[PDB]
Ligand binder design. Structure first.
Ligand code: B12
Ligand code: B12
Ligand code: B12
Ligand code: B12
Ligand code: 5AD
Ligand code: 5AD
Ligand code: 5AD
Ligand code: 5AD
Lengths: 223, 273, 219, 221
């Protein structure tokens, strides 16, 4: 309303002033909060609209790192502090996953020997794996995202049968990795990659997988 | 079923006899039958085909390409289910999507669910249980089909007004039945807010209060998570509480204090009125 | 169709929010009608709606292409002016550029995509680039109207494995000397409404009928 | 110290992340161009995003997009780079501007048709104008370049467009137009760009606008 008065003082007409203020889009720095606030009140439309802005503004990889991830992290912290309930997190996570799934389907899927992407048994956090899949696809790697929580014998069978060149695992929790016997990941695929918040160099060496710090290097390692 | 002479076809289609003769020789179409009278006769489906082909030519297609297109054999609707299953099982996302696209085009949104998405999901479960396929295979199929359902979900409207929370009982990780419920409700103009699976009842009641949710819908694929709940556990989740799914039943729903719904079609009528 | 709307609401009543919350067969028309009245908002929504139903490639074949042809025909018939077509083309081109940017761009020796000199229809080239991108080929779309000496230089310097040309008009191809496309790149691909096998053989490029075969061709 | 204070504000992984966060703004221009010229779309995209995050939407245009374009022009003119190279850079940079354009709002109400005079194929300045208008709440309809004046005049009539804006990068297409050719395109007709000038605009019966900042104000009031 202060801005509107400012525009009126500049010689603008009230009709023009009101229309301009309403037609005003949300500042990029505010996209994170806006997207979070939109989800918490069940405004899926506004949320989808806001994510789309960030996509155009930051780009595909950019909006994940600058919007999708920060919102999820804040959702996690708010829950741990007890500031939001589980249903709220569910709402945001399910949504943000749908967006990531769209981006994934829009990326190319090259032919040739696939790279199986998933999370270790007991890991139900799947978005980190989708990030891995998406970055690989964006770089021309036929990343086949299976979904999360795949038994090692079943994972090994698929990689053999499809002749997969590699397997990539995302560990958000460290407990499922620690619950695995030594060398559990060794013969999953010709190359085995382990990364994620719950992963580290020492634990990967124990399980017989190659540790990857960031997603950028994951692509270079494969190509 | 020959009914027209090449002279007659030239008059109807506007294509010269030389051209029609040439395309037959060069591309194998059209093929008029030869009568005992010796005349070579084109069918009514040859004329309409050539009218269509000619339109494609005017749009810039080459005769070879147009004819190849008209003739091109697509996958039969009855084989779409099998084809989609086989496509997923070899890690052919491209083929799998093309097949789902075709089925969606052929059956429509609700149609493709009953004729393709649901049958394939059911079959994947049976295949795993018989040891025919592994968990990784099933994971792949479910993730794919969930993405398709999410598209349809997003393609349906999201009406304003007090939402209807859709989720699964605590301990239930099968979410497609819930997405499916949300989808049917959106198609009928009801703002179904799908939360994802496995939601604690207190948190569920809290959100329903805060958003002023008019109703809550639960999908129970397994019966064990329902059995783990005390009598009347679902009573005060929302002003109205709905329970459905293979793991749900009228008796069990009555015990938990929820309204039981057999089919998704009837779920809409309960909410819409 | 505001009157027909009130009729539909009454039918449900005999048994408003439902009515406010589009059939796929009508997406083509709706998208065109929106553009023709300058409703970019409505247009963008309908394309995205079309996108989610047909998929990336599908919405191009079932929505982008039919609309453009109708725009082209309407222009010829005198139904619409050049200004209308301009609006529609710019919009649809923007959508394809989005899809193009949204698909991956793999590393390794690029494939240069453009049109022959004098060819200013660029969307077909974007279509070719896009299909290659979707199948994991590093398609570098340059834009239209690239002089052959310049195109050849870029391909040499970047070590491009191939060059792809889209010809919508056949005249700019005819204006080229025999074998003009021979030494552009290790492989040279020619396709489009204005291209044909004979003209391609003459210019020394490999003729490609459909975009599907173009991806297969590079492997 | 101010750098070190910022670095502290931003354990093993953190040091690599915090330190590699800084990048000289002045070097963004060259880096973006070099990225394009070797066909590195990934790097080019990354560099543009970095600059877009640093300077903002309006900022990245003046400090990155426009300077690069001009340099591409200079590089070609000196024989340094080929036409194919320039083509590549422009298409990329157009995509970015097109993104920024659609990112800005499209307000309701009578549109403003934006294009170039017939024979003008440089279109970025025209997009730029559409961008600047939209950001100030004016419903700028960008048509694309090279629009016949009668057709332009017809569309403006049908949509009840309040104004027409023309971007002239070359002066020849303006010189090729008859007196008063731009007079009745729309209730208001605006001509600007490196190929435009006050006297020439005056001849064609259009209002001359020096810069894009003032173009919005003319319409906003
Ligand atoms: C959504 C969510 C859930 C959802 C999952 C939804 C789904 N289907 O994915 C549900 C509700 C199922 C859930 C459950 C639980 N979760 Co939870 N959840 C989250 C939340 C909010 C976001 C999850 C997410 O995907 N975020 C995005 C993640 C993946 O990003 P990121 O790890 O930073 O990833 C980066 C890098 O690691 C890289 N990366 C990822 N994968 C890979 C792979 C490779 C190869 C490479 C190179 C890099 C790489 O990509 C990113 C680049 O920046 C997080 C909060 C948080 N801090 O992340 C909590 C969080 C992870 N969850 C947590 C907890 C406690 C749980 C539960 C135990 C809760 C409970 N008591 O039931 C269960 C565990 C179930 C299980 N076994 O998985 C804690 C973990 C605490 C800990 N000790 O580590 C968190 C941190 C919340 C908190 N603040 O306390 N959760
Ligand atoms: C995919 C899948 C999974 C995925 C889930 C993916 C996901 N995120 O949703 C994963 C891998 C996680 C999984 C795990 C498990 N699953 Co499972 N899974 C399936 C599968 C193949 C389909 C799941 C699905 O959503 N299908 C769609 C279903 C719901 O369709 P439908 O039955 O025809 O349902 C209709 C109606 O019920 C209606 N409906 C559903 N919800 C609602 C709600 C309302 C209100 C209304 C009105 C109607 C309605 O919708 C349909 C309309 O026609 C099913 C097989 C099957 N037939 O369902 C097995 C199945 C359900 N799972 C099974 C099992 C055994 C398990 C596991 C215990 C396996 C294990 N040992 O680890 C775990 C349990 C996890 C848990 N805690 O919940 C068994 C169930 C055994 C039983 N009869 O008790 C099945 C039947 C497989 C089998 N044949 O053995 N599973
Ligand atoms: C938009 C448009 C323009 C815009 C272009 C904007 C832009 N930046 O692209 C502008 C305004 C520049 C324009 C100008 C002209 N155009 Co015009 N234009 C059109 C329009 C409406 C659509 C063009 C389009 O994008 N089509 C979509 C493309 C993708 O279709 P397609 O080429 O058939 O592509 C398919 C296949 O060929 C394949 N393909 C394409 N490239 C490749 C490459 C490979 C390797 C492979 C395998 C396959 C492949 O991809 C598609 C798959 O379905 C068409 C109408 C129409 N019917 O196409 C007229 C049309 C093409 N134009 C036409 C004309 C006459 C002109 C002008 C001469 C008008 C004039 N007098 O100035 C000028 C010529 C400019 C020049 N010198 O090149 C005529 C051409 C007729 C002819 N051949 O003589 C058409 C058909 C209009 C009409 N008469 O109805 N045009
Ligand atoms: C990219 C490009 C092209 C591309 C255009 C792609 C496209 N789709 O738009 C193509 C390949 C088509 C091209 C062709 C040609 N071009 Co050229 N091109 C350029 C380049 C590198 C950038 C053009 C651009 O978009 N600039 C960005 C604009 C925004 O910058 P600006 O003009 O300074 O604009 C500012 C102000 O004027 C204001 N402004 C602009 N519009 C408006 C409107 C209003 C109302 C207002 C208030 C303000 C305003 O906005 C900006 C604010 O800073 C320039 C280099 C340069 N120095 O500009 C050469 C340049 C413009 N081109 C040039 C030439 C020679 C040509 C060709 C003749 C080459 C040829 N032989 O074919 C043709 C002409 C085609 C035609 N009929 O128009 C010369 C012009 C020389 C001259 N004689 O004046 C330049 C200057 C290059 C050079 N240094 O030699 N070109
Ligand atoms: C990591 C995420 O796990 C979710 N979370 C915590 N407890 C439960 C539960 N009982 N059921 C389901 N999800 C739960 C929270 O929403 C948190 O954000
Ligand atoms: C019902 C579905 O449960 C999946 N399933 C079976 N065992 C496991 C497991 N250990 N972890 C995750 N999913 C499993 C199978 O893929 C089956 O299809
Ligand atoms: C192929 C498209 O080219 C456009 N078109 C036709 N004539 C001209 C011209 N003189 N200048 C610019 N564009 C033109 C029309 O809008 C047609 O649909
Ligand atoms: C102003 C811009 O025009 C481009 N340019 C110069 N000559 C041609 C041509 N024959 N065809 C296409 N573009 C050309 C150059 O790439 C220059 O940068």
């Amino acid at each position: 309303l202060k801005t509107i008065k400012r525009w009126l003082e500049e010689g603008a007409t009230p009709k023009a002033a009101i229309r301009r203020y309403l037609a005003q889009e949300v500042r990029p720095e505010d996209l994170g909060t806006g997207l979070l606030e939109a989800l918490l009140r069940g405004d899926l439309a506004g949320a989808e609209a806001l994510f789309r802005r960030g996509l155009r503004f930051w780009g595909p990889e950019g909006v994940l790192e600058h919007l999708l991830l920060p919102v999820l992290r804040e959702v996690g912290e708010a829950w741990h502090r007890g500031e939001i309930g589980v249903a709220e997190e569910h709402l945001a996570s399910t949504f943000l996953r749908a967006r990531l799934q769209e981006l994934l389907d829009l990326a190319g899927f090259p032919p040739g020997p696939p790279v199986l992407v998933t999370t270790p048994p007991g890991e139900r956090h799947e978005i980190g794996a989708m990030l891995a899949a998406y970055h690989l696809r964006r770089k021309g790697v036929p990343a086949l995202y299976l979904g999360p929580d795949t038994p090692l014998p079943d994972l090994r069978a698929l990689a053999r049968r499809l002749g997969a060149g590699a397997v990539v695992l995302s560990a958000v929790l460290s407990e499922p990795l620690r619950a695995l016997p030594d060398g559990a990941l060794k013969d999953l695929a010709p190359r085995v990659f382990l990364g994620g918040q719950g992963a580290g160099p020492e634990e990967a060496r124990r399980l017989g997988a190659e540790y990857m710090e960031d997603l950028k290097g994951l692509a270079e390692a494969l190509w």
